[PDB]
């Protein structure tokens, strides 16, 4: 599992229908680092230091075994530098 920071919300209107209505956020390891998109299971405000899961584990955290997710936020860090 990885520790990332939410920067901004990402909107993809024509996304595949298998994604449901789960919102998407743009998370990066550190400011200026590569940006990735994570399905948001536990709601995160921008700037939150979130904890994200990857691989097949992501699909379950997205609310269904068949969900098409590679990165899924599963928790918000209470206190992170």
């Amino acid at each position: 599992m990885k520790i990332m920071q939410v920067e901004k919300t990402l909107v993809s209107t024509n996304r595949i229908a298998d994604m449901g209505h789960k919102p998407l956020l743009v998370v990066w390891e550190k400011p200026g680092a590569p940006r990735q998109v994570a399905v948001d299971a536990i709601g995160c405000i921008p700037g939150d230091w979130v904890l994200c899961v990857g691989s097949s584990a992501a699909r379950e955290a997205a609310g269904s075994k068949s969900y098409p997710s590679d990165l899924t936020i599963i928790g918000i860090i209470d206190q992170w530098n």
């Binding site: 209107t13 919102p23 709601g43 405000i45």
Partner: protein
């Protein structure tokens, strides 16, 4: 910011959950929280049709089983100028 998205719910706890999900899902501004009466509480957001489409969709799942539940989840891409008079401008 001329697309309107509304979520109606029974009680206030579902409304705040829907509002939180709607505003964390896309770049939508929360313009209203109207106590309709009889329990109904509606949250109105404004933004681009794409952003409001995603906001309302995310909010609906967030508040479907919070409290008594969800009543409506409506998106209006282009709202007539007349209707703007009854719509709120600021959340307070």
């Amino acid at each position: 910011g001329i697309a309107l998205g509304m979520i109606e719910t029974r009680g206030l706890v579902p409304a705040i959950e829907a509002a939180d999900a709607m505003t964390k899902a896309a770049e939508v501004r929360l313009v209203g929280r109207q106590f309709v009466g009889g329990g109904y509480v509606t949250v109105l957001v404004r933004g681009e049709t794409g952003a409001v489409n995603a906001a309302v969709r995310a909010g609906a799942d967030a508040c479907e089983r919070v409290g008594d539940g969800l009543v409506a989840a409506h998106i209006i891409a282009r709202v007539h100028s007349e209707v703007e008079n009854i719509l709120p401008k600021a959340p307070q």
